Amino acid sequence: MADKVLKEKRKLFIRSMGEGTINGLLDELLQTRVLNKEEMEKVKRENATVMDKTRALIDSVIPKGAQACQICITYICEEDSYLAGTLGL
Amino acid sequence: MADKVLKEKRKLFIRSMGEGTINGLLDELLQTRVLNKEEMEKVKRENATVMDKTRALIDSVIPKGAQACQICITYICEEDSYLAGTLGL
Amino acid sequence: MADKVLKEKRKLFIRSMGEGTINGLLDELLQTRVLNKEEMEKVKRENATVMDKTRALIDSVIPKGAQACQICITYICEEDSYLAGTLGL
Amino acid sequence: MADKVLKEKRKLFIRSMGEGTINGLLDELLQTRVLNKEEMEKVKRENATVMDKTRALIDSVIPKGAQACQICITYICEEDSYLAGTLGL
Amino acid sequence: MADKVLKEKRKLFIRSMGEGTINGLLDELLQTRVLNKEEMEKVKRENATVMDKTRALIDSVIPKGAQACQICITYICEEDSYLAGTLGL
Amino acid sequence: MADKVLKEKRKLFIRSMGEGTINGLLDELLQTRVLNKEEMEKVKRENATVMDKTRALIDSVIPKGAQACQICITYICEEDSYLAGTLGL
Amino acid sequence: MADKVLKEKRKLFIRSMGEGTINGLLDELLQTRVLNKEEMEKVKRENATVMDKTRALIDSVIPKGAQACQICITYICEEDSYLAGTLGL
Amino acid sequence: MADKVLKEKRKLFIRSMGEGTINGLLDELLQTRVLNKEEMEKVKRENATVMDKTRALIDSVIPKGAQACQICITYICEEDSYLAGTLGL
Description:
The structure is a homooctamer.
Chain A: H1 2-8, H2 10-16, H3 19-31, H4 37-45, H5 50-61, H6 66-79, H7 81-87
Helix pairs in contact in A: 1-6, 2-5, 3-6, 6-7
Organism (chains A, B, C, D, E, F, G, H): Homo sapiens
Subcellular location (chains A, B, C, D, E, F, G, H): Cytoplasm; Cell membrane
Protein name (chains A, B, C, D, E, F, G, H): Caspase-1
């Protein structure tokens, strides 16, 4: 499932992802109702660097299960194909 | 019945619960008068990690009976449907 | 009285109120001497999201009595009429 | 005298006192030499919630006599007029 | 001596000093080796408001003796002459 | 072995370690399954200063054995070569 | 001799010691093997105020002879020269 | 060595260095692998004033040793000769 894949690639995700991808993924997750306004604002406002934002986003998304990680994987593949190829997914 | 269901899923609740869901559930339980101000303050301020907060909340809610557990389950299902699905609710 | 009204609508205030309203209400409460400088600074500086700020402000204002909550209600009605209508004030 | 008044209002004090007022009252009591450094440190660091801090402060101040209670009452009246009014002082 | 003066003006110091003066005084105390790196980091990172920072700094400086308080008084006089005149030193 | 080396360099580690290095080392230890989520969250959330974080991390890593200290030493050497040379690794 | 000096300066040590100095002295004593891990954890976690920590540390160090007290005196003189001068060391 | 020099001139560095020098020195330190991407971004993004940036940079560079401070000193001498002459190095 997608949760194991996302757990296996955590360091690469932290070291590779940028701010525009963070914003787009947050918008997609809010649209799909995986996250609510409070969680999104906690991710955005409580962290200053993009590494901390990625860390918080991954730690928020993984416990939700495989159906929540599949949305992230599909969005990244469809919108960040170069980053998706670098990440091996 | 709701209390037995909440007892059977304690470990999953501890391992899967997030901070935003904790805050929303605390607000809802305060609104329904299941918990008072002092209990919510003890939950929030005496614990540093989200696992400790979830542990304290479950240990404070289960003894209250089945009607408080039903309120908790209903709120989680209506507001955190992905977590509710991964928990088996 | 106003304290019961403000206690009955706590969740709506938490989910509905924005940062500009927080700043204006804090200025009004400081001018009316309901709060002092230390309380305002703890509301502003110890919280990162606006939900936490609203939570702290309500928890600080409710115990002061009905005369302190009436000031908040009047300010919201005269300055945020759309939000006041949504909240039912 | 002030000690009897503070004794008959213990529950209201516990349920209504805030953190900023506690900090200011501790500063005033330290300045007036009613309490020493160790007592204030035990009040601050051995309690996590504001209710516990208020409980400890009242239990430490009442045995000292009427003058120590009068200092607290005067400070609260001069600096927290809304709380003083809702407390019946 | 300087320690008695700093003990007699604790409330005024807490209520009057700002963040820039705190930063300058911390730099001066680190340069004079009155405080070490750990104490300065503990003052800065464990307090959110400037009142808490001033409280921690005064409580850390007073026990060191009169020679440590003289450095603080001299720095404040030479760098914050308006605040020094307000404080009466 | 690596555990003895980590025991006899504890003070240097506490006095020299930085926050970014701790974040990277925590990510590496989570990836290698030396630590789980609860221990990492206790290290990150229960300590406010970098010295306390380093102290907690070292006290959590040493009892695990030589094979975890080896992972820590290897990561530090490959990622913080200047700090590794200063420490004597 | 060091043990007698530390025994006749106990009140000054209790009233003048700070938390950063306590942490540094604990690290030094653990490095020199004067104390083991259990004693350090018992000093740190069973006391809430710095006065209690100082009392526990002094009562743990004095019965171990003159070398253990000399180590503490040397560390304090080398790292806390202002406090050492205040204490007459 | 250079680390002692940077410890001695910390206040002058904080009060004398501008933003262009910060940017150039950060680029040089990233090129020489004294700092990594996370530390550089943490210095840049979590501080608003140039004094805070200089403070963070010095506190991050000093613990790395003398070979990391010599790089900074050499870069400042080669690129900011007027500032280097003012700093006396």
